[PDB]
From Swiss-Prot:
Annotated tissue distribution: Expressed in most non-lymphoid cells and tissues examined, including prostate, lung, liver, colon, heart, kidney and pancreas.
First and last residues shown, out of full length: 44 to 194 of 348
Task of the protein: Acts as accessory component of the N-oligosaccharyl transferase (OST) complex which catalyzes the transfer of a high mannose oligosaccharide from a lipid-linked oligosaccharide donor to an asparagine residue within an Asn-X-Ser/Thr consensus motif in nascent polypeptide chains. Involved in N-glycosylation of STT3B-dependent substrates. Specifically required for the glycosylation of a subset of acceptor sites that are near cysteine residues; in this function seems to act redundantly with MAGT1.
Subunit description: Accessory component of the STT3B-containing form of the oligosaccharyltransferase (OST) complex. OST exists in two different complex forms which contain common core subunits RPN1, RPN2, OST48, OST4, DAD1 and TMEM258, either STT3A or STT3B as catalytic subunits, and form-specific accessory subunits. OST can form stable complexes with the Sec61 complex or with both the Sec61 and TRAP complexes. The association of TUSC3 or MAGT1 with the STT3B-containing complex seems to be mutually exclusvice.
Localization of this protein: Endoplasmic reticulum membrane
Stated name of the protein: Dolichyl-diphosphooligosaccharide--protein glycosyltransferase subunit TUSC3
Disease: Intellectual developmental disorder, autosomal recessive 7: A disorder characterized by significantly below average general intellectual functioning associated with impairments in adaptive behavior and manifested during the developmental period.
Lineage summary: Eukaryota, Metazoa, Chordata, Craniata, Vertebrata
Record organism: Homo sapiens (Human)
Assigned protein family: Belongs to the OST3/OST6 family.
UniProt-reported outcome of changing C61S: Reduces N-glycosylation of cysteine-proximal acceptor sites
Cysteine pairs bridged by disulfides in the record: C58-C61
Residue stretches making up the Thioredoxin domain: 18-146
Lumenal compartment residues: 3-153
Reported effect, C58S: Reduces N-glycosylation of cysteine-proximal acceptor sites
Amino acid sequence: ASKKENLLAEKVEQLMEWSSRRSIFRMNGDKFRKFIKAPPRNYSMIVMFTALQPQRQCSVCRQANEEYQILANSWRYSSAFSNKLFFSMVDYDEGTDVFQQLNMNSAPTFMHFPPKGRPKRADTFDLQRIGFAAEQLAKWIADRTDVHIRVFRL
């Protein structure tokens, strides 16, 4: 019943809830900091950094978004055995300060933010080697978190 553990339980409850209307949490800088950067956390976060506004003309962003949606929706269909994994996105035009902080000069990028510490090397998905099939994103998430998502349909 510490202030911290009540805070933590309150955060998780806010995420658990938001993911009951949207399988992917659309974040600006403030939201990214609150739910990803700020302690405490006991959950993993997956983030797709993207640039989906038409003026950015990022075709790969658009294609990868479709597979990310397929993946997050597969998870939302069959989880809630877990409040330990959540999915989010940061769009360049909504979180430009986050891209700057992460020294991102391109898109899209998928990252895993563990509950403690900083992302490790392997916590950046190797898009340029693997491509972005939902099933490959899932394999990578399993490797990093031991949460295994069965993608339906492809």
